[PDB]
């Protein structure tokens, strides 16, 4: 039983909650609070310090409750307080810180081989061909953003429905060789993946934020080990 505990403990550790957005609006303050007049060069570390000794405060209900399941408490208590007496930055710390379906092609080259079926994956992010459907190849990959829709050039008889994929707003070609017609059986499916084109993103035809989310890793990073060592100790101290 007494071993549940010091397995459940972790989990009493993980109930804590915090607001993110007023967790960024202190943070900002701090920043401005702590360069007082000047304008500042670099990020302060009271910004830092301050954050993290207001979360380590927290820690001291777990472990009472752990206790709980004199001189037992005081020790605990103790080995909290010397955790808000030094910020150890070298522990270990960061030191120096939609649609899937088979297409064919349509312009066929060298390195087509063939007019045949492709496995293409349709993502909000980016896009991917395969030579199979276990999405494993990974041979082309092509982004949602700056990719724009077009359509075939008057001339080509629909034996099959062809929409085409143009990168427009990057240099990287993304070997869209002959503007990557991609052919259909039947019109349906051509304006279903057009659509689908569309709602991922396709087009339809301060500095002081850096500051604040770079606390915001350091703080997380830190507590990581914080948390770590109170893990150890409870199931020490209490046995001695």
Known sequence: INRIFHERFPFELVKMEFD???L???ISYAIKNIHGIRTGLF???????????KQVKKIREPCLKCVDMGRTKEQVMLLIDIELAYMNTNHEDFIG????????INNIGIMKGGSKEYWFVLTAENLSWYKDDEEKEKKYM????NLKLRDVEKGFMSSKHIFALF???QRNVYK?????????????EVDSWKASFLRAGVYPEPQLERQVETIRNLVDSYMAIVN???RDLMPKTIMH
């Open 24 to 26: 960024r609006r202190e």
């Open 167 to 169: 990168n427009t707003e």
């Open 97 to 104: 810180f939609i649609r899937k379906g088979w297409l064919t």
């Open 176 to 188: 869209d060789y002959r503007q990557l017609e991609l052919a259909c059986e039947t019109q349906e």
């Open 142 to 145: 092509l982004s949602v953003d």
């Open 20 to 22: 993110e957005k007023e």
């Open 43 to 53: 990020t302060p570390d009271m910004a830092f310090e301050t954050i993290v000794k």
């Open 228 to 230: 770590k060592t109170v």
